[PDB]
Amino acid sequence: SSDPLVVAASIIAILHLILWILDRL
Amino acid sequence: SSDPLVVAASIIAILHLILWILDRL
Amino acid sequence: SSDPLVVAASIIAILHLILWILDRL
Amino acid sequence: SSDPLVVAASIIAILHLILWILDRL
Ligand SMILES: N[C@]12C[C@H]3C[C@H](C[C@H](C3)C1)C2
């Protein structure tokens, strides 16, 4: 398993790419 | 748990979304 | 090991650097 | 212990913030 602060920071990263891919889209 | 350079890069990522969110106000 | 969301976000980031060193190689 | 693709992914993270403290306030 990974640290929680880490799983958070990633979710923040994964959601960013989405809002990007919609902003662009 | 999770490797510390990986807790590092994270504290930076979260803190970054903070400064940014704040940058709008 | 490290959670999957983190191995996912990471692949993005490594693939992010990749899409750069090329866009400007 | 975090995945390697993840420990790597974060050197390029910690290496970004560095090029940054090296540019602006
Ligand atoms: N930008 C990221 C920092 C750290 C490593 C990787 C996954 C998470 C945690 C988000 C990219």
Chain A residue closest in CA terms to D3: A2
PDB resolution in Å: 3.5
Number of domains forming the structure of chain B: 1
Q: Tell me if A2 sits within 8 A of C3, measured CB to CB.
A: yes
The reply to whether residue C7 touches residue D8, judged by beta carbons under 8 angstroms, is no
Residues 6+ apart with CB under 8 A from C6: A2, A6, A7, A10, B2, B6, D2, D3, D6
Residue identifier of the C-alpha nearest atom 5 of ligand 1? D10
Give the nearest partner residue to A14 out of C1, C2, C5, using CB atoms.
C5
Residue identifier of the C-alpha nearest atom 10 of ligand 1? A10
Tell me, rounded to whole angstroms, the distance of Cα A24 from its chain centroid.
17
In short, whether B18's Cβ falls inside 6 Å of ligand 1 is no
Q: How many CA atoms lie within 13 A of B8 on its CB side?
A: 16
CA A15-D13-B19 angle, 5° bins: 60
Query: Solved how?
Result: X-ray
- The residue behind tokens 């990749």 is C18
Residue A9 CB burial class (10 angstroms; 0-12, 13-18, ≥19): buried
SS3 at position D7:
helix
- The residue behind tokens 């809002």 is A19
Enclosing domain of residue B12: 1-25
